[PDB]
Design a protein around this ligand. Sequence first.
Ligand SMILES: O=C(O)CNC(=O)C(=O)O
Ligand SMILES: [Mg+2]
Ligand code: NI
Ligand SMILES: [Zn+2]
Length: 331
Amino acid sequence: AQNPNCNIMIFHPTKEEFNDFDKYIAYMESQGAHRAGLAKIIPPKEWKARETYDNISEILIATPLQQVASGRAGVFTQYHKKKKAMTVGEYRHLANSKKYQTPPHQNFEDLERKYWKNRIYNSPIYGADISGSLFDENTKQWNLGHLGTIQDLLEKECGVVIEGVNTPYLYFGMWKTTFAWHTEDMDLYSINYLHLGEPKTWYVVPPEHGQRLERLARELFPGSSRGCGAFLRHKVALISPTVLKENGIPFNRITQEAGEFMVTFPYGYHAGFNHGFNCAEAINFATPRWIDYGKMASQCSCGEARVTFSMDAFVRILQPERYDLWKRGQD
Ligand SMILES: O=C(O)CNC(=O)C(=O)O
Ligand SMILES: [Mg+2]
Ligand code: NI
Ligand SMILES: [Zn+2]
């Protein structure tokens, strides 16, 4: 078995190898990359997502989210308070303000220490989940607005034609902005490109050990657990590396820098934080190997997780028994 310790793998494709997205994913899996839950892909040196970022300041963040924490430094939840709209230029200025800017630090490890020590005492503002793309239409390789769609993958593998669309999302981050422990909707893959700015640190649990994380989460968030049988779908809970180590949960960590892709694999729990002002683009995708994960994916039926139009069809076709109760949650 390749990669039996489930380490995060890093790939350096040539420009020739960067032509065929599906083939390269299947290559990475042949080397065991999926066992980690997360892989890094460094694009060929000749490749660019677009010519410059000089003209992005007029993008609108319609509903910036202030991430308010509750709990203890290593075990907390966050709630998202909606703020008034602002442009990316306004948000960048905010991120660079004395109140919100990255503190002085020695290296990524010192900054990671400061994040876990101090996150809960601040409420950074995240411009998340903004439909759109920053890839130039002329970028033909690994353009996250030009991928094969999940609906087309399901049709190719299973023969069934379904409604729905699959488009990317932009994330504008600042120091301390945080993504809670989660897997993707329907345990899909994700791909994330860091277009610009400061780094993003990731934590990941190997898919084969995801249920260990879930059992710990039920112990650490016991009222949430009684409220919903899949409450990590709410995307609100954080658990630090120190706490994961104290409880024997297998995980890995890596820092993504501007210009790099990350891929999360089906049922790979991940969480993380931004080091400073940045912009990422991400989208879900599927391969043939995903189908079985989609059939087995947990679902939130308490009503909190409230997800896309396109997930309807996935549930209806892959999980017809759950269909009924899950749609009661979504209506
Ligand atoms: O970048 C973020 O805030 C969150 N991104 C992801 O969870 C992802 O790409 O799967
Ligand atoms: Mg603009
Ligand atoms: Ni994700
Ligand atoms: Zn729920």
